[PDB]
């Protein structure tokens, strides 16, 4: 591989990455998301968690199959770090994929937050989640390309006319503005 090692310096990144806003983060395309969903990496990837950081109404109006909705930092830490999601075999990998509507600001931030917490509870350079990626373009670019991998087969933008109130209600739940 021509890149650096994953977070615990144990091995190279598995997935092919594409260029994204944050030069230091690893992004993947809809295509690689589908290869994982289709089991193309089944002999090496034990588990892969898709974290959809969007607000609940967004997730309810259409999300990627198997994805988990973890819109708040506290929910993500609770879900991923209280009892780490570990592979059934040590020859195997666990991978996290973060995304939001277009995975621009919120996705990167949650990803950076989980890495910090992970660095915090482990002895360097050990990690529970050494390999993390962001889905370039988020759901918004994923849906039109592979609608049958989404449930419900639909899309609800964050700024949807009819949920202005839910967006407001929801922002008031975040730890900081």
From Swiss-Prot:
PTM: Phosphorylated by BRSK1 in vitro. Phosphorylated by CHEK1, which inhibits the activity of this protein.
Location(s) in or outside the cell: Cytoplasm, Cytoskeleton, Microtubule organizing center, Centrosome; Cytoplasm, Cytoskeleton, Spindle pole
Superkingdom of source: Eukaryota
Residues of the Rhodanese domain: 44-151
Catalytic site positions: 100
Positions carrying Phosphoserine: 83, 176
Function (record text): Tyrosine protein phosphatase which functions as a dosage-dependent inducer of mitotic progression. Directly dephosphorylates CDK1 and stimulates its kinase activity. Required for G2/M phases of the cell cycle progression and abscission during cytokinesis in a ECT2-dependent manner. The three isoforms seem to have a different level of activity.
Family per record: Belongs to the MPI phosphatase family.
Subunit structure: Interacts with MAPK14 and 14-3-3 proteins.
Protein's UniProt name: M-phase inducer phosphatase 2
Protein source organism: Homo sapiens (Human)
